């Protein structure tokens, strides 16, 4: 049972890594959307 809980929390860690990658992509999209704007 304890091993099941640790595997679940590790799946939560991978969820959080997804969260930081998503914030990262959103974070560079604000810098980049400027380039799609100035491109035209």
């Amino acid at each position: 049972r304890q091993k099941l809980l640790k595997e679940q929390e590790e799946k939560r860690l991978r969820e959080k890594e997804e969260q930081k990658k998503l914030l990262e992509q959103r974070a560079q999209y604000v810098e980049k959307t400027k380039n799609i704007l100035m491109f035209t």
Partner: protein, 209 residues
């Protein structure tokens, strides 16, 4: 039409996202599988002289490990794009440190323009896709196995275990649809993982050329 072009625009953009995700770039899991409604709500649902007009649904994505490695995915509105049209696309890629690009023409570009794609080649790799080929993700078809582009460190280990010159592997030519999906260039090995009915799995390698 107006509704059918929105449907096609959304399907093309989805396939582009699944491409840039397979090429290794960084796409959010939301942009990967968004549905058509929030594509309507996101741009304009009106391509017939409206808001999801092309050159506004263009995308920049940076590579996954090298965050300076970017790629544009442009969308020309000229169905038959010209030299004077990709000249400007390349003119404002030069303002950045972006080299790779991707042109999704509506009809074929002019053979006058395709030279400017190879003449600019070693300095700015860009490639075209007809918008018709992008309406489906062909790597999902059930005949197309799984293609994995090998790194140069492991090509050497492959040629070294089998003691084999790169000239003796099977070939896949550079214009293959699945080679242009992954954007491999000449002299680059592709691993292929096939489900075999006598052995269970078979891994074969193909050198691009």
């Amino acid at each position: 039409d107006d509704e059918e072009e929105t449907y096609r625009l959304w399907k093309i953009r989805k396939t582009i996202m699944q491409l840039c995700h397979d090429r290794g770039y960084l796409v959010t899991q939301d942009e990967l599988d968004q549905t058509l409604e929030e594509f309507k709500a996101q741009f304009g649902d009106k391509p017939s002289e409206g808001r999801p007009r092309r050159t506004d649904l263009t995308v920049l994505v940076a590579h996954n490990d090298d965050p300076t490695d970017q790629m544009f995915v442009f969308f020309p509105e000229e169905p038959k794009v010209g030299i004077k049209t990709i000249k400007v696309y390349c003119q404002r890629m030069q303002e950045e440190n972006i080299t790779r690009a991707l042109i999704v023409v509506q009809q074929g570009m002019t053979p006058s323009a395709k030279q400017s794609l190879v003449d600019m080649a070693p300095k700015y790799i860009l490639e075209q896709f007809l918008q018709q080929e992008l309406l489906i993700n062909i790597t999902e078809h059930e005949l197309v196995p799984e293609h994995v582009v090998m790194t140069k460190e492991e090509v050497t280990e492959l040629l070294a275990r089998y003691k084999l010159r790169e000239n003796q592997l099977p070939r896949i030519q550079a214009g293959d649809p699945v080679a242009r999906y992954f954007g491999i260039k000449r002299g680059q090995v592709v691993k292929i993982i096939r489900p075999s009915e006598t052995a269970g799995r078979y891994i074969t390698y193909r050198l691009v050329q």
